[PDB]
Ligand binder design. Sequence first.
Ligand SMILES: Nc1ncnc2c1ncn2[C@@H]1O[C@H](COP(=O)(O)OP(=O)(O)OP(=O)(O)O)[C@@H](O)[C@H]1O
Ligand SMILES: [Fe+3]
Ligand SMILES: [Mg+2]
Lengths: 228, 332
Amino acid sequence: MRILAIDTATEACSVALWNDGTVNAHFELCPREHTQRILPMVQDILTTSGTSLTDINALAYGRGPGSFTGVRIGIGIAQGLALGAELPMIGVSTLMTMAQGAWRKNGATRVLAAIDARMGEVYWAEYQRDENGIWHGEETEAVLKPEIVHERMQQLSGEWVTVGTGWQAWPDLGKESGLVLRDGEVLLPAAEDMLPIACQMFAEGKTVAVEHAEPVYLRNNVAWKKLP
Amino acid sequence: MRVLGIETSCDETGIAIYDDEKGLLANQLYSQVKLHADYGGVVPELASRDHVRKTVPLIQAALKESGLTAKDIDAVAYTAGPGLEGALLVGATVGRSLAFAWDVPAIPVHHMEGHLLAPMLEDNPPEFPFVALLVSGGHTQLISVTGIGQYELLGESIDDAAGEAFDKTAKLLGLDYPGGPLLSKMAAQGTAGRFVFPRPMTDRPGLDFSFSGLKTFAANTIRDNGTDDQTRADIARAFEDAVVDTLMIKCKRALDQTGFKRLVMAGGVSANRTLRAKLAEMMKKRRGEVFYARPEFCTDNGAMIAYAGMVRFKAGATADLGVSVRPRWPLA
Ligand SMILES: Nc1ncnc2c1ncn2[C@@H]1O[C@H](COP(=O)(O)OP(=O)(O)OP(=O)(O)O)[C@@H](O)[C@H]1O
Ligand SMILES: [Fe+3]
Ligand SMILES: [Mg+2]
């Protein structure tokens, strides 16, 4: 099984390749350069691992949330590749990706992901890894004001790890929460961390044809007022 | 050869395939008018989102419509600008990664060059050189065209484009956005001469345009006259007749100045029936020739991008792996 993953949902661009076990991965900050670096990085990862696009079994993309523009770059690039090489696609949550990264880095199994969404809000999720390595919490994904995050945290218990730029923009987000909070050491999603999630989704038959690939935006109220 | 063209500059998603032996093999279009009507304008974020939903499926329908497969396409063209950054990025990212996966050349196309070349999709297209009147939603320009990629700016609007002037006056008349075509359907019922509007920038030499004062002139007339159906029509006709005579006069001056005998008209306003008749008449009396596209190719479409990508490819304009769009991107 070969899986190719790409992510441009945040200030990072990353690509990663899974070859039946061995991982090859690149990651970099690309503020204002996503569209310039992404396809060169795909090319390089394919050539350095001596694999061609036609030998990939599935294409995993960062489906959101994040920068609207970044999320669309990601899905657009993934769709072009998948349409062109007739690849099935696997959409991976940006918040879940960062949780997988905290697991990889320090074995965290309870992750509070917060992404700065702008507009004084964050993209929020509560992910918990089960004994079989499955992440639970997809249903908790939401865009929320910091005061609402505060109230939600007071309904949680115990010990959690923090990941995402939302904690960086609001370092007191977890103040008076009642939880023990530790830094998860993950600011941004990495395509490397999509691969294990994408691997499990592929095993479950949970892939889609290119025309069904969907972005997840979370903030949907994005229009100026309608006319009378 | 065959080129797949992708247009996502604003609020239309267009996909087409153009074959330089057999012509246009596929044309697919999704207009977002319903979505933006509610807002009285295009919401960039909503336009961007809808392109994501339409682009891939319209590409698939195009290949289905043409009975072609991936190996039959020699290049992928996509609009790189001008237009809305967020919309442009959808077409350009799909288009550029698609070309990478098919391993064929990727062609960034200038949206206005797309409009300019649309009349080349009809029988007996224009030879160089010619004057071109680009009259669209956000552009109004006169251009001396002496060859491929050889564009010289003769004149342009210093304020509103003619398309927007139609839209603004149409809204004042209480019509749905964009009302250009609707205003035009209303004008047909009006009696010529009932009101007479100014022909802006015609009492001095020069090839530039202005439409802002004409808008106010019509707005003042609407305010100080009856809102009955016949009076509304008389105003729409005076306005359209003013715009059409202005463009005609400027085209005349541009033909006089260049000495060319061919007039090419492009962009959405060139679907206007009064304007087509007026410019055809003028070119008849000059013993010259007018060229324009079928109405559905005057406004946005992918056909014009597949053609213009074909032309840009033959002229050597290909993209590296980096993708860039240019929201503002001067033609000439
Ligand atoms: N029959 C008509 N009479 C007058 N104006 C018309 C007619 N048909 C279309 N238009 C105008 O053409 C404009 C849109 O044409 P077009 O699609 O070329 O603009 P566009 O895609 O926005 O290009 P640009 O980016 O330069 O604005 C609108 O303002 C519309 O009302
Ligand atoms: Fe246009
Ligand atoms: Mg348009």
